[PDB]
């Protein structure tokens, strides 16, 4: 099941100058386009080999549209500052996300200072406000019938162009790298650490209540890593086994020291 997402972040910076606005697009866990207001030449630019080939119209429209997004969220930063009656010297963050999943479900959500603000429901015909301030934006969105404009994109363009990208980058987007695994022994009792290396996508299930589990991390080459540890009494090592569940592997393997 594949998906395409677009994200944006507007971070106000009093004194420092104008609000920063960054946006990017993803297909599954792979970034293909990026935009940063700080760049010397703010414009949407390729991040994945399979879309740089697109003609100059594409980049001209993507860039022109994305610049309009920056200006809008900059304007929103001040609108929301009013709703919450906030100082003009504090920094605030307005995050946006949109995407389509293969069409099974669409979405569009906004977040202010880390908390949910406004979200489009699954039905793509209604909104959900997180607080009283968001209720204003909700009524403004309902009275403006913008939902139709949003579902049109999610049902058409989003899905339409998603198929296009999924074919152009077939080598990169439809390939899963299995995890390289092994167990290590660390005498303290003793600690058993289970490793999963060089895998893709990032989703993975590692299991041994008292087990330490670190968030999955990027290796830096495009693959990910993750390990799980457990302190066990000497000689009781053999009673423990590590379970690794990953999409690349046909079935989930079980490891033991």
């Amino acid at each position: 099941s594949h998906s395409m997402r677009y994200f944006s972040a507007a971070v106000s910076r009093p004194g420092r100058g104008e609000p920063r606005f960054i946006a990017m697009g993803y297909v599954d866990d792979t970034q293909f386009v990026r935009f940063d207001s700080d760049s010397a030449s703010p414009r949407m630019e390729p991040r994945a080999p399979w879309v740089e080939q697109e003609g100059p119209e594409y980049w001209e429209e993507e860039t022109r549209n994305t610049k309009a997004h920056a200006q809008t969220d900059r304007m929103n930063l001040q609108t929301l500052r009013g709703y919450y009656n906030q100082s003009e010297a504090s920094s605030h963050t307005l995050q946006w996300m949109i995407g389509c999943d293969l069409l099974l479900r669409g979405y569009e959500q906004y977040a202010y200072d880390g908390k949910d603000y406004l979200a489009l429901n699954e039905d793509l015909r209604s909104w959900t406000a997180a607080d009283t301030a968001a209720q204003i934006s909700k009524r403004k969105c309902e009275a403006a019938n913008v939902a139709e404009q949003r579902r049109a994109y999610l049902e058409g363009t989003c899905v339409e162009w998603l198929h296009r990208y999924l074919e152009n980058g077939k080598e990169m987007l439809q390939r899963a790298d299995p995890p390289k695994t092994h167990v290590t022994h660390h005498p303290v009792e003793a600690t058993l650490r289970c490793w999963a290396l060089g895998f893709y996508p990032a989703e993975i299930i590692l299991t041994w209540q008292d087990v330490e589990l670190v968030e999955t991390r990027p290796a830096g080459d495009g693959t990910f890593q993750k390990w799980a540890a457990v302190v066990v009494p000497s000689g009781e090592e053999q009673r423990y086994t590590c379970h690794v569940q990953h999409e690349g592997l046909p079935e989930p393997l079980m490891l033991r020291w």
């Binding site: 944006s8 386009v33 594409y58 809008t72 304007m75 906004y110 934006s137 403004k140 969105c141 994109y153």
Partner: peptide
Amino acid sequence: RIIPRHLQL
């Protein structure tokens, strides 16, 4: 392809 317009909260 990005949606051409951003919402006005």
